[PDB]
Design a protein around this nucleic acid. Sequence first.
RNA 1: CAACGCGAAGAACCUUACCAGGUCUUGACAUCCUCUGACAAUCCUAGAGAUAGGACGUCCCCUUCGGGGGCAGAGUGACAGGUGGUGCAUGGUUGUCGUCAGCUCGUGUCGUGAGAUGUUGGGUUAAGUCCCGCAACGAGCGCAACCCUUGAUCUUAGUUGCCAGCAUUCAGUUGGGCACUCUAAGGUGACUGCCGGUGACAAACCGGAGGAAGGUGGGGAUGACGUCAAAUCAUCAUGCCCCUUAUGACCUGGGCUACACACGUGCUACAAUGGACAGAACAAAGGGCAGCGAAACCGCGAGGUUAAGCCAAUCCCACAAAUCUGUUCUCAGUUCGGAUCGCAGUCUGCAACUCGACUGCGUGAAGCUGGAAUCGCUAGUAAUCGCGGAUCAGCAUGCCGCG
Lengths: 151, 77, 103, 206, 95, 60
Amino acid sequence: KGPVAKRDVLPDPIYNSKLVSRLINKMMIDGKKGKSQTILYKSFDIIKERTGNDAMEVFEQALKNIMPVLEVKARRVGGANYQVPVEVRPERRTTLGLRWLVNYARLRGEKTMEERLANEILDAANNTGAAVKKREDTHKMAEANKAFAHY
Amino acid sequence: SLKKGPFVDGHLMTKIEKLNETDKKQVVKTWSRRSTIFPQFIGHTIAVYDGRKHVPVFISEDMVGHKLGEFAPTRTY
Amino acid sequence: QYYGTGRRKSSVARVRLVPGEGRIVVNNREISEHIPSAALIEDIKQPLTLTETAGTYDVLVNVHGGGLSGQAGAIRHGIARALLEADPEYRTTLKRAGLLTRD
Amino acid sequence: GQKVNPVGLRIGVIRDWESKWYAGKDYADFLHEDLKIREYISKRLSDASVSKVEIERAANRVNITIHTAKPGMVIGKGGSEVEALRKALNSLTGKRVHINILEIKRADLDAQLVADNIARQLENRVSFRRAQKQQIQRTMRAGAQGVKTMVSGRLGGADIARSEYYSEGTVPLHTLRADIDYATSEADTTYGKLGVKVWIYRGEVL
Amino acid sequence: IRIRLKAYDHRILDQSAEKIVETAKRSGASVSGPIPLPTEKSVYTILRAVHKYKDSREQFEMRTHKRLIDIVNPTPQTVDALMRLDLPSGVDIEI
Amino acid sequence: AKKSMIAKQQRTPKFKVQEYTRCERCGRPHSVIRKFKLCRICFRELAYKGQIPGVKKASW
RNA sequence: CAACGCGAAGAACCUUACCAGGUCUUGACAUCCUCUGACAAUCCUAGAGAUAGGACGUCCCCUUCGGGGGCAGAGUGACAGGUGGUGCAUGGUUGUCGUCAGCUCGUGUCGUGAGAUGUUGGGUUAAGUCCCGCAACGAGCGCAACCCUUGAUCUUAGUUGCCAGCAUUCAGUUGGGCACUCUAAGGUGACUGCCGGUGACAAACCGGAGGAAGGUGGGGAUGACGUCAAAUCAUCAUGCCCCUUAUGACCUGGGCUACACACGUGCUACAAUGGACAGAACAAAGGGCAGCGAAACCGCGAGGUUAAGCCAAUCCCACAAAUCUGUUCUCAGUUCGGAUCGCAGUCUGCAACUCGACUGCGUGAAGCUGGAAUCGCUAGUAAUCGCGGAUCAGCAUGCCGCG
């Protein structure tokens, strides 16, 4: 066996970014990529409107904040069910950040996914945020499981 | 039937006509649960074969809007 | 009259790259007349931007079959194929894209 | 579930259609008529040991090709046999019927007649070993790259019915181009019913 | 003037088309070549099993190759030739 | 009750609506075929036996 | 596992087997025997009809006069019927291991024996595929292979396909071209073909150019010996056993569709990626003769009337919806869902009452994401939106396929 390759589509006129393209690929339901594209466009527009700054930098800072450095992987060595901290590769970090962003944004609850994602990007740029709660919990678990930094 | 006209069996209609030309009389037995009730059915205590017996039923005025099967149950419990 | 076929997911782009100014006809329609959501319009010209062929060839196509996205993909694929068959000088550059998927 | 017969799989590869015509609005009717014709001709010539019978539709005329392996038993004197075979079909069908009779050389090679002879020998109380071995040797001396014969049912037992395999040579059923002749036969004995399965590999075509 | 063919036999239909084309061209009628019309096809699904085992299934294929030939010049000689032409029954020649 | 059922199928029905289909070879209702008017197993075996010029093994 | 959207690819009668009732007994169905000659076809009564009471009415033909070729009847018994039992007697047909890679045979050797050697050991592959060594040499069933489909190209051909170059058109409709998709035919092609490296120098593996195709290109057909006393006596035959004026047969109606219930499979819902309204684009495959049915009119509507065209690259089914651009509502058991529901209607058919679907009217709950646990999915796959056909007078959330 072994790993496998893959690729995506970068070009996006509204805040061109490969991570933005990956996010667009995410949050998509029922094969409706157009809905996700429109939602992301309108959310970035609302961000640019409310905050006098380019949404690209805000999104980058939100990703830098939510990205988890250490992952806590379970492992059952005997009747103990231990856990092992793990160093997350940048790809897995970005994917986990996207997952948490989307999930907690849709979990927040507002009148529109656009406003939900906008407020989530804001509460991510400002470390105080839902996805950052998940980040902090994961970091706490990794710290508590530091005893198994390496087998 | 929507505009082709109401529905009734020929033999049952002939029996009812023979019975009504002079006066309404003894039950008119028939197996035609399909037949729809007409104003002529009024006064005639028709019988319907529910599968094992004939149930005589007195057809009143308001019965015109139903079928004999509506008054002839079949399932048992 | 350079010709090409942008076969992609049942959507065929009967493209004939003839020398023109840069007009792109889709089933006898205009770009905006046919395809809203211009996010894909800029993508169609991806190879047209990789190689400088801005306004020297016209694109007359009769795209039959497929949705909007599949039609745009077939259009750009046929454009790339016809452009390569016309001038293979930049085939070394366009081999890193290909756009052939057998979808 | 087990293997499938090659008769239905080799069509289009090498074997041609046993029925060659293009019909319309009467496909099932002509098919049923031909089925009845085949049933009748098989029940009649069952003693004449006929292998197969092809039919061709000819615009209200029917051309029937018969492979019997023994002409003197299907045409005999020429007149009586042809009359009895053609007028009966004409009367039972309703239109003209033309008959052609071909003779199968090396009659010990066609699965149909091979299974027929094996079933006859079984019904004659012949041992299921002697008959099988003799038929296999006969086929092999007649010339065949491979012969497979299977008999299942009650071979003398009451509580258990089991199969028996006896084959020599190469019988590559999985090879598409094999021209394997396949046919089945039944033998109703006093102890029950016996089934004979025979598929013979005659050769491959390049 | 036109004539069509419909057959399930690939090679027989091909040979019949070639023969008709030759017979019609040898007299100088300039008949257009055999038009390769789309072949109509159908499929039937049947269960391999007898009673149980719905999953076990087979597929049967039916194909008919249709071709058209259109005459350019009247050439009654070609008409008589085609009229006196005898081909197998697997094509069901139709005018 | 098989040949009795076949005779009943062959009977002249009171109304044409009362008519039902049978494969004309066996007494198997429940998915008789129209195009061939042959029973499932019967049609399969006959097609395998070289008859039915039009039907052959399918592959896609 | 291999029963549970399975037989059964469509139960108002018919299908129908099962039951209440009215009935019959060379019988509903096929050979036998003696005759009397055509039966049918229209009409009244009982009918629910089976069936009779019956009337109108029987036109049969072929020959050198006997007879023969069917149909109906009138008598006799050989018989018929078995959806009656046995799949622990069977043929035939399928499911599982399993598309897993093993299962075997001739000769020779060893072991006094059951047995082993070939098939073991090393490398290698999806493979007991292949190579090396080899006390063994060869071979069969298998596996890849040639079969079909798709991915690219040369040629053969342009009408019922295409419309650019040309001229006309409201329409690809016309003259005109076969440039080109396209369709249907012959070929070619990808076969470790080539180079480097590794490996034994081999079999074999990684990378490299070409190319549509690189290491069985993807998929389908193809299911090795045998196991489950696996399923089918119901598709068919089947020995044995059992009934036979009845476990057989005809007909009306009923049941096969009942539910305090529980469980498999599927569809719809709980809403803001949303609900309703206005505008717009793209489809792929398949069917059409008592069949498919343009167009027009009527009707909110399902649909009805006249009817063009099509035995079909022509004409039709048949204007795909998701989707996009707008208007509007606003977090609520709601402008969510439409189930149950009353009425009024549409498709069919003698008749949708036990018993279809669909449409409008007025409401609208269960339901706001659902317990252990459990299921499918590695790419055009998951998810999801429509389209056509089987069974069919009329019936699909299931089946088959397509996009």
